[PDB]
Amino acid sequence: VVGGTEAQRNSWPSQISLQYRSGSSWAHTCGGTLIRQNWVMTAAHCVDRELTFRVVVGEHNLNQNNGTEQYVGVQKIVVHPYWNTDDVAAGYDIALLRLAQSVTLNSYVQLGVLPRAGTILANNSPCYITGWGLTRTNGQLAQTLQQAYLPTVDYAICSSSSYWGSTVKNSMVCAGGDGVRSGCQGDSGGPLHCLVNGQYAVHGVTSFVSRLGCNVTRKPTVFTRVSAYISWINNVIASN
Amino acid sequence: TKPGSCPIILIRCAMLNPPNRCLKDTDCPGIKKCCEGSCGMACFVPQ
């Protein structure tokens, strides 16, 4: 997250760190949202590789034991059937991971709330992106969970030619593009939290940014619109 | 290595070290172009 602030230790209890086994060590690779005690929602491009994965819940500082964390192996990986590894602009950038075990909920570990199927946010809805991503274009991963205020850019606007034109699909959500705040490498697969009628829900899955940089004026961060996959989500979980 | 050009791709997945599906144009069939995709290297039809 470029231009954010460190989040309060209990601000986003559904935020997970997806990590891969790197030699003997583990490497933070992407964000995710805890949606069930044994299920996690992420980006397809994060788990579409032959790596050994784990999830960390109640994570705050990636380099220190806070004492609030739980480590869990990944039992099942379910990638959207229409996902094309090559084409992130085609959409369907979403995957569900079945945890090896069910987590214990507490002050720091809580389920993420998804939107009612089809929910569309008006232009400029108040959202927050969270993640351990680069804090600057070509910078270093944050150590502590960061958060930045990133409001919606409705489709009509986002898909206009001064924005993302034909790149952005109606199955995606754009937020930010002020040239100051944005998601950046290592934020992928994490939530976009929006406040709608006094309630927060997870409306986005961080997907992609511009090739010219993370925070580029009129190049908002693009997320997979969760509300478009509720039935897919619903069937996977019900049957896996 | 390759007769033609790779397409410009202006979106990047917001992940570090994305998986490569080729390294050389030769890892690609026919009008084999190993190029920088939206999330790692992939095989494009040139220009």
Swiss-Prot record, chain A:
Residues 1-238 form the Peptidase S1 domain. SUPFAM superfamilies: Trypsin-like serine proteases (SSF50494). Ca(2+) binds at E59, N61, Q64, E69. Its cofactor is Ca(2+). The active site is at H45 (charge relay system), D93 (charge relay system), S188 (charge relay system). Disulfide bonds join C30-C46, C127-C194, C158-C174, C184-C214. Pancreas. Basal layers of the epidermis, hair follicle and sebaceous gland epithelia (at protein level). It is an enzyme of class 3 (hydrolase). This is Chymotrypsin-like elastase family member 1. It comes from Sus scrofa.
UniProtKB/Swiss-Prot annotation, chain B:
The chain holds residues 71 to 117 of 117 of the full protein. It is found in: Secreted. Disulfide bonds join C6-C35, C13-C39, C22-C34, C28-C43. Residues 1-47 form the WAP domain. This is Elafin. Consists of two domains: the transglutaminase substrate domain (cementoin moiety) and the elastase inhibitor domain. The transglutaminase substrate domain serves as an anchor to localize elafin covalently to specific sites on extracellular matrix proteins. Neutrophil and pancreatic elastase-specific inhibitor of skin. It may prevent elastase-mediated tissue proteolysis. Has been shown to inhibit the alpha-4-beta-2/CHRNA2-CHRNB2 nicotinic acetylcholine receptor and to produce a weak inhibition on Kv11.1/KCNH2/ERG1 and on the transient receptor potential cation channel subfamily V member 1 (TRPV1). It comes from the Eukaryota.
